Amino acid sequence: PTEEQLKMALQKAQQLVNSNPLVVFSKTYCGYCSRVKKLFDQLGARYQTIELDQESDGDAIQAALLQWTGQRTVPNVFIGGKHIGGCDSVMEKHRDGKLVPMLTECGAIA
Ligand SMILES: N[C@@H](CCC(=O)N[C@@H](CS)C(=O)NCC(=O)O)C(=O)O
Numbered sequence: 001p002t003e004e005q006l007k008m009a010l011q012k013a014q015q016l017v018n019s020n021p022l023v024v025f026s027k028t029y030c031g032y033c034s035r036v037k038k039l040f041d042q043l044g045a046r047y048q049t050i051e052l053d054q055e056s057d058g059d060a061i062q063a064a065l066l067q068w069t070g071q072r073t074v075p076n077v078f079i080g081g082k083h084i085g086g087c088d089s090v091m092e093k094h095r096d097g098k099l100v101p102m103l104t105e106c107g108a109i110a
Contacts, residue, residue, distance in 0.1 A: 080106030
């Protein structure tokens with residue numbers, strides 16, 4: 001990715017995060033992505049999925065997410081504009097009772 005491509009990809013990722021209470025940066029056949037989506041489904045939370053493998057600038061987006069979050073893998077979850085992390089991170093928040101209130105606070109759960 002060129003520096004302009006990384007910049008454009010970051011802007012794209014930020015706009016998605018800004019315009020969705022819950023965002024799941026994903027890949028279509030990632031088992032961990034499927035797990036987190038299933039959890040959110042069952043919690044009644046609406047999310048925007050973005051499948052990097054189906055985006056033309058998916059590599060640039062993954063590079064931008066690394067720069068932005070230090071994370072190299074999908075799923076890469078944001079809630080209310082804030083970085084959550086991967087499947088494990090989301091499961092951790094579900095485990096300590098913080099996830100539903102976070103999801104409610106930002107509108108992801110009505
Ligand atoms: N501990 C991480 C593991 C996630 C993970 O390993 N994701 C794989 C996809 S199955 C990945 O992103 N591999 C590198 C890639 O596909 O870019 C989590 O719970 O989210």
